[PDB]
Nucleic acid binder design. Structure first.
Ligand code: NA
Ligand code: NA
Ligand code: NA
Length: 327
DNA sequence: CCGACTCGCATCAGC
DNA sequence: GCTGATGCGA
DNA sequence: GTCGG
């Protein structure tokens, strides 16, 4: 459903969602507007009235009205007022820097810090994460074309294997489902030396390696199971430098790896469909395990999982390739 | 009418 | 010092 | 803001 179809309504709503998250700090209002704006992007019909829209799941009365004012006039008075509000402007913008959330942004704008220049004038009051968000502001808002991701995947599989032949790594996310474009790289790692009933240097030895070969240029966080940081593909000595990109590497107990792979892969709507369908078939699925729901509602022990396919067998579902996992 | 709408890591509040 | 809260991102 | 117990 193209941008000309019902794009104007959707940008409105998303603009409204941003301000609820960034200025009002009303995360559920943020997720509301988003939810409305998303189902609206599904509807294959240039919407003609708020009434029409209200028939959808997630469009309530108040949004129906906003669409009504949008449709009649071309704009929403609330947005325009918000659009040219100084503090709201600067607050909403500053959150675009990774590491600055609405609380930090609101604090910066309190003491006059409103623009990247202001941030740059004040490395002092920026934690480590925020400086990397500043540093890579432009690079981080860029998407990653699939061939770059495919290239990045080469480096990650090669060096991980080179650290140990026992590691298992899967780039998940949209990419794994076939998407011609991604916004970050989501690596799921595991070893046979790591069960849920069990070493605390398994992730550091892969992180280190990828810094030795100068793939990982920066670090936002690293612990015993999650690394978040920056990487960038090597340039041609003549051809321009690639933009730095965000990467996440996550260590998972091998007895839960294929559970996490499915979850960190499958689309949102797919994942609900399956945890909708798993319950009616008597099992419960979270990111970690699959447990059988006993008669009176009580979940039992987690059952073996050793493939993605396995989990479909438990719930009586044909395995679906990640490419066909849109919903 | 009224509550619902996950978690590992950095960092701060408080002891 | 250490525990727990809160922010952030995802 | 929206849904629903
Ligand atoms: Na952001
Ligand atoms: Na941010
Ligand atoms: Na933010």
């Amino acid at each position: 459903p193209q941008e000309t179809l019902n794009g104007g309504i959707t940008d409105m709503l998303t603009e409204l969602a941003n301000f609820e998250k960034n200025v009002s700090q009303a995360i559920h209002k943020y997720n509301a507007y988003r939810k409305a704006a998303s189902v609206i992007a599904k509807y294959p019909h240039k919407i003609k009235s708020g009434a029409e829209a209200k028939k959808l799941p997630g469009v309530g009365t108040k949004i129906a009205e906003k669409i009504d004012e949008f449709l009649a006039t071309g704009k929403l008075r609330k947005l325009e007022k918000i659009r040219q509000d100084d503090t709201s402007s600067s607050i909403n913008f500053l959150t675009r820097v990774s590491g600055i959330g609405p609380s930090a942004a609101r604090k910066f704008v309190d003491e006059g810090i409103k623009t990247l220049e202001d941030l740059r004038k004040n490395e002092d009051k920026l934690n480590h994460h925020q400086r990397i968000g500043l540093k890579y502001f432009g690079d981080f808002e860029k998407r990653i074309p699939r061939e770059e991701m495919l290239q990045m995947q080469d480096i990650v599989l090669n060096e991980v294997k080179k650290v140990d032949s026992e590691y298992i790594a899967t780039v998940c996310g949209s990419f794994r489902r076939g998407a011609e474009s991604s916004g970050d790289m989501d690596v799921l790692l595991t070893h046979p030396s790591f069960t849920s009933e069990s070493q605390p240097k398994l992730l550091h030895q892969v992180v280190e390696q990828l810094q030795k070969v100068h793939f990982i240029t920066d670090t936002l966080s690293k612990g015993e199971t999650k690394f978040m940081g920056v990487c960038q593909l090597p340039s041609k000595n003549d051809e321009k430098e690639y933009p730095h990109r965000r990467i996440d590497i996550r260590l998972i107990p091998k007895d839960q790896y294929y559970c996490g792979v499915l979850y960190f892969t499958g689309s949102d709507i797919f994942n609900k469909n399956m945890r909708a369908h798993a319950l009616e078939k008597g099992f419960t699925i979270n990111e970690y395990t699959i447990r059988p729901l006993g008669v009176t509602g009580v979940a039992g022990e987690p059952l073996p999982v050793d493939s993605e396919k396995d989990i479909f067998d438990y719930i009586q579902w044909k395995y679906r390739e990640p490419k066909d996992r849109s919903e």
